[PDB]
RNA sequence: AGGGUGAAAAGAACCCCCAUCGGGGAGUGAAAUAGAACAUGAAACCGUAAGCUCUCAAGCAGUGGGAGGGGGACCAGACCC
RNA sequence: GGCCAGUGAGACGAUGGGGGAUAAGCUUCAUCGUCGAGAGGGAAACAGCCCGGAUCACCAGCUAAGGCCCCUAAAUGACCG
RNA sequence: CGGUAGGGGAGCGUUCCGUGUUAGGGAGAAACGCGUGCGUGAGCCGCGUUGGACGAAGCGGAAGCGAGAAUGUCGGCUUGAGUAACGCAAACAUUGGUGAGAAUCCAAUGCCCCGAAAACCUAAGGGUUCCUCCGCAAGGUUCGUCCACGGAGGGUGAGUC
RNA sequence: UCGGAGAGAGGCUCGGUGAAAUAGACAUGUCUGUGAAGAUGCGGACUACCUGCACCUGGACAGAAAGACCCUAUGAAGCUU
């Protein structure tokens, strides 16, 4: 086994190297044309190569959700997860950033929604519909409230699940993602912070 | 003069099968079901070629919109298009969106000297 | 549901279970080694051992006790004469189960039982 | 070309034995040592084994006599079980209606294979990758090179 | 009572292969006994 | 209901597995990828081998877009899976 | 006027009425629209409503009906209530 | 230049005939399976493998001339599935033998079941099933060295039945 | 009432032999909405690794027999005056 394994791997390396030297691959920044001049990138609509959009290279964001509007925040969050943010957009793939939400339990809502709004899950039984209010749920598990608001705006389907994971909601103010240096989120809206 | 059919049947049903020989399961190998399915394949092709033309455009518009919103805080696709025709400038959506990808410098340059 | 119930049925009713155990016990005693199934063997250890134990106390009573069992006078007279000499030392457990290859026409598991 | 002399296709056929019940057994011995296979087939609890065993042993004896290579070398390369020639009894059933029961048959085939026929050639290619010993323009690299034929 | 359609293909393969794996298990066990047959056993 | 080995039975001496059946060498023959279940041998159906590929999925199974991977003893922005 | 067809179960909507209980996706007439025999876009899905009549190609453009927080193209546009 | 019923125009193929006992063909026809040619399409056209002798055009002719639907029809092969079942709950067990192989064939020993039968004779009917030696492809609801099965040879004697 | 225990024959597991009606294709979830007015397949949600075996029958307007009721055909046949 050993002999044939090492010998096989020595061929696998060489054949890997033979192709790596056959046509090369940029990143973004760049200028229209180059010394690639292979298949027509220019009259064929752009479509991302996996080499571009790897999950390490993706940007990060943090939202402090204190004294905000739940829905208005969530739309921007959804946008920044999708990648409609970015010029290089593609519906088929996720090329969007991550999002981190903190102080989810201090998020605000207009009108008489703190009592009247109901969050329902139905166990999947002949009896069990379980329905609890906004504030009642917030006392227990406030994470959901943001999380649920966001998932409703993301595109449901195989992608919808995968790029949902990118949301990171939290109860309190501090968060454990200091390593990633997540920058602050830009916010298109006038109504987004509450009157106070 | 009895006329057996023989040759004439499966010489066409081979051609029928030649289409469907990437299909998955029963559809690939069952004469009459292949004949039922090939038609539908061609119909979905013909239908989607016209969907293509509008859907690519719709993608391009989103690309351009995404690109242009990164300039001024209140500047937006809708205004951008009317600003192009205000200056008389016949760049179609394909070119605009593809330069927005492959050379964002050039969109910066077009954005700079359209405003004035 | 068979909790703490210990009885080897041998696929049969009580008619034929005792009929089996009796005859098997007789033949085993006669020949000294027999080939049978695992279950027919493993069930048989209560009755061979009981009868060898019965052959220790060779008395009018115990010979009739044993003679109701064997249905062959001349085997049970071999015991009583034989047993206390060639088993006097041994204190219980007069029976060995060697185990050998399934039966051809039914994959029935198979064994040997013989006196120790 | 890559083999051709690393085998002997013994194909004992018209065995009176359903194909699925033969594939219970033959799926286990596709790629084993021949010694091992024989030890398996005598202890296994199947009617299926006996005619298979007969053909394995006949095939190995065939290989030892005819092409004259060692039984300890060889393995079972390609085992394969195909549909035979079906016979159809018409049995009665309750209430006058009648149904067929079939006597199925099979065609068994076994391709044995010596390990060490093209070993002189393969062990020589323990020589590491960037070598290309260009002697007869290309030459005899014809012995199950296995891993790649990337020769553009 | 009665089947609505046929399972047809691929599903019947999946069903049969487990049954052949029963055979595989028996083969393993029979292989194990051959070594036991070689040496000792008293 | 059930025709078509070959020109010619030349229908397989001998050897091996082996109680038979049948099989592999040998021999005959233009051919035995014509071996008596024998001529051309389509489809369904059953496999074996290789290339890619499914175990958080939802699907009349395709279609437009196409990530990543593989080619064809013939150096293509071409073509195929 | 010659030669030679199908049709003779219709449906819904607007209006004018009858029958009904000015009930019915009810029924029967009269005038017109659509379906029937008509794809496409708006109406979540939705024959019969609105827009519009598919010879075919384009990875061009302008618009109708309808829309411009996100799912999902376009203003998280404006000023007054 | 949307189009159901429906009408009109223009074509493609199928086998056979005239031309033609044409050229083309055992340096490979018909067929069969594949084509990074062609056409608006039905279809056409070149390919080298399998195949082993038939037979293109072109101009014309004639029909048993084109199939997915008929609870069509004939043949093949699936699915259900390695599932239900294996035809009474009288009952088998052991030792030895035979043999390539035996729960199942033969022998012995036990044990059990029938006994106004599951006993032994006749009539009808079957029509060779009877006996012997051989065989085990098929048949026998499993196996099988065994058989009412297959092969080979035999066997039925009347004045009073 | 109000069930409980036990014996056989099955069922279950292993080996041997081996059917059937059924079957457009099946990659065959629940909720409510929609539609030839009662959807695994259409819309929105919800739920849900892939795959056996044992048990259970609510649905596939499950299978079986071109409704035997009802009505139609200038159908058939019996019976009556």
UniProtKB/Swiss-Prot annotation, chain A:
It comes from the Eukaryota. One of its GO terms (biological process) is translation. Keywords: Chloroplast, Plastid, Ribonucleoprotein, Ribosomal protein, Transit peptide. It is found in: Plastid, Chloroplast. GO terms for molecular function: mRNA binding; structural constituent of ribosome. GO terms for cellular component: chloroplast; cytosolic large ribosomal subunit; ribosome. Component of the chloroplast large ribosomal subunit (LSU). Mature 70S chloroplast ribosomes of higher plants consist of a small (30S) and a large (50S) subunit. The 30S small subunit contains 1 molecule of ribosomal RNA (16S rRNA) and 24 different proteins. The 50S large subunit contains 3 rRNA molecules (23S, 5S and 4.5S rRNA) and 33 different proteins. Component of the chloroplast ribosome (chloro-ribosome), a dedicated translation machinery responsible for the synthesis of chloroplast genome-encoded proteins, including proteins of the transcription and translation machinery and components of the photosynthetic apparatus. Belongs to the universal ribosomal protein uL13 family. This is Large ribosomal subunit protein uL13c. It comes from Spinacia oleracea (Spinach).
From Swiss-Prot, chain B:
Keywords: Chloroplast, Plastid, Ribonucleoprotein, Ribosomal protein, RNA-binding, rRNA-binding. PROSITE patterns: RIBOSOMAL_L20. CDD domains: Ribosomal_L20. It is found in: Plastid, Chloroplast. Pfam families: Ribosomal_L20 (PF00453). Its main location: plastid. Component of the chloroplast ribosome (chloro-ribosome), a dedicated translation machinery responsible for the synthesis of chloroplast genome-encoded proteins, including proteins of the transcription and translation machinery and components of the photosynthetic apparatus. NCBIfam families: rplT_bact. Component of the chloroplast large ribosomal subunit (LSU). Mature 70S chloroplast ribosomes of higher plants consist of a small (30S) and a large (50S) subunit. The 30S small subunit contains 1 molecule of ribosomal RNA (16S rRNA) and 24 different proteins. The 50S large subunit contains 3 rRNA molecules (23S, 5S and 4.5S rRNA) and 33 different proteins. Belongs to the bacterial ribosomal protein bL20 family. This is Large ribosomal subunit protein bL20c. It comes from Spinacia oleracea.
From Swiss-Prot, chain D:
GO terms for molecular function: rRNA binding; structural constituent of ribosome. This is Large ribosomal subunit protein uL22c. Belongs to the universal ribosomal protein uL22 family. One of its GO terms (biological process) is translation. Component of the chloroplast ribosome (chloro-ribosome), a dedicated translation machinery responsible for the synthesis of chloroplast genome-encoded proteins, including proteins of the transcription and translation machinery and components of the photosynthetic apparatus. One of its GO terms (cellular component) is chloroplast. It is found in: Plastid, Chloroplast. Component of the chloroplast large ribosomal subunit (LSU). Mature 70S chloroplast ribosomes of higher plants consist of a small (30S) and a large (50S) subunit. The 30S small subunit contains 1 molecule of ribosomal RNA (16S rRNA) and 24 different proteins. The 50S large subunit contains 3 rRNA molecules (23S, 5S and 4.5S rRNA) and 33 different proteins. uL22c binds 5S rRNA in vitro; the central segment of the protein (approximately amino acids 30 to 124) but not the last 28 amino acids are required for this binding. The keyword RNA-binding applies. Keywords: Chloroplast, Plastid, Ribonucleoprotein, Ribosomal protein, RNA-binding, rRNA-binding.
UniProtKB/Swiss-Prot annotation, chain E:
Keywords: Chloroplast, Plastid, Ribonucleoprotein, Ribosomal protein. GO terms for molecular function: structural constituent of ribosome. It is found in: Plastid, Chloroplast. Its main location: plastid. One of its GO terms (biological process) is translation. The keyword Lipid biosynthesis does not apply. One of its GO terms (cellular component) is large ribosomal subunit. Disulfide bonds: none annotated. Belongs to the bacterial ribosomal protein bL32 family. Component of the chloroplast large ribosomal subunit (LSU). Mature 70S chloroplast ribosomes of higher plants consist of a small (30S) and a large (50S) subunit. The 30S small subunit contains 1 molecule of ribosomal RNA (16S rRNA) and 24 different proteins. The 50S large subunit contains 3 rRNA molecules (23S, 5S and 4.5S rRNA) and 33 different proteins. This is Large ribosomal subunit protein bL32c. The lineage of its organism: Eukaryota, Viridiplantae, Streptophyta, Embryophyta, Tracheophyta. The gene is rpl32.
């Amino acid at each position: 086994t050993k002999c044939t394994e090492e010998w096989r791997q020595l061929k696998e390396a060489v054949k890997k190297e033979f192709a790596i030297p056959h046509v090369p691959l940029d990143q973004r920044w760049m200028f229209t044309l180059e010394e690639a001049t292979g298949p027509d990138i220019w009259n064929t609509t752009w479509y991302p190569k996996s080499a571009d959009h790897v999950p390490t290279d993706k940007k990060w964001y943090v939202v402090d959700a204190t004294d905000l509007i739940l829905g208005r925040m969530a739309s921007t969050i959804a946008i920044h997860i999708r990648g409609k943010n970015l010029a290089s957009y593609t519906p088929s793939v996720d090329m969007g950033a991550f999002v981190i939400v903190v102080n989810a339990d201090k998020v605000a809502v207009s009108g008489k929604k703190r009592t009247q709004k109901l969050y329902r899950r139905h166990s999947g039984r002949p009896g069990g519909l379980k329905e609890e209010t906004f504030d009642q749920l917030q006392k227990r598990i406030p994470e959901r409230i943001i999380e649920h608001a966001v998932r409703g705006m993301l595109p449901k389907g195989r992608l919808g699940r995968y790029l949902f994971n990118h949301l990171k909601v939290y109860k309190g103010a501090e968060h454990p993602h200091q390593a990633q240096q997540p920058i602050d989120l830009p916010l298109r809206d006038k109504r987004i912070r509450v009157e106070k | 003069t009895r006329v057996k059919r023989g040759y004439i049947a499966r010489r066409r049903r081979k051609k029928i099968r030649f289409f469907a020989s990437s299909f998955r399961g029963a559809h690939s190998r069952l004469t009459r079901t292949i004949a039922q399915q090939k038609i539908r394949a061609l119909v979905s092709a013909h239908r989607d070629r016209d969907r293509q033309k509008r859907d690519f455009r719709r993608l391009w518009i989103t690309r351009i919109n995404a690109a242009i919103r990164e300039r001024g805080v209140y500047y937006n696709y809708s205004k951008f298009i009317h600003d192009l025709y205000k200056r008389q400038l016949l760049l179609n959506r394909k070119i605009l969106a593809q330069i927005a990808i492959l050379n964002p410098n050039c969109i910066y340059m077009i954005y700079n000297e359209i405003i004035k | 549901m068979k909790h703490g119930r210990k009885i080897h049925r041998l696929s049969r009713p009580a008619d034929q279970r005792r009929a089996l155990l009796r005859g098997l016990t007789t033949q085993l005693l006669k020949h000294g080694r027999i080939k049978t199934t695992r279950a027919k063997a493993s069930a048989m250890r209560k009755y061979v051992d009981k009868m060898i134990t019965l052959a220790k106390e060779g008395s009018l009573h115990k010979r009739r006790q044993a003679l109701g069992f064997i249905y062959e006078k001349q085997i049970v007279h071999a015991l009583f004469a034989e047993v206390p000499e060639r088993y006097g030392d041994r204190n219980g457990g007069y029976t060995r189960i060697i185990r050998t290859l399934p039966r051809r026409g039914d994959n029935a598991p198979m064994a040997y039982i013989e006196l120790v | 070309e890559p083999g051709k002399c690393d085998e002997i296709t013994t194909r004992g056929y018209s065995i009176s034995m359903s194909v699925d019940k033969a594939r219970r057994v033959i799926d286990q011995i596709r790629g084993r040592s021949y010694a091992e296979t024989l030890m398996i087939l005598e202890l296994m609890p199947y009617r299926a084994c006996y005619p298979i065993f007969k053909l394995i042993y006949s095939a190995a004896a065939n290989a030892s006599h005819n092409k004259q290579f060692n039984k300890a070398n060889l393995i079972i390369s390609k085992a394969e079980v195909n549909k035979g020639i079906t016979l159809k009894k018409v049995k009665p059933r309750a209430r006058g209606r009648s149904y067929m029961i079939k006597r199925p048959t099979c065609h068994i085939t076994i391709v044995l294979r010596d390990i060490t026929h093209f070993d002189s050639y393969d062990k020589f290619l323990e020589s590491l990758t960037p070598k290309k010993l260009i002697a007869l323009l290309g030459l005899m690299s014809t012995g199950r090179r296995r891993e790649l034929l990337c020769g553009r | 009572a009665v089947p609505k359609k046929r399972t047809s293909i691929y599903k019947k393969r999946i069903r049969k292969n487990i049954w052949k794996k029963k055979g595989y298990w028996a083969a393993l066990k029979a292989f194990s006994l051959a070594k036991s047959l070689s040496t000792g056993n008293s």
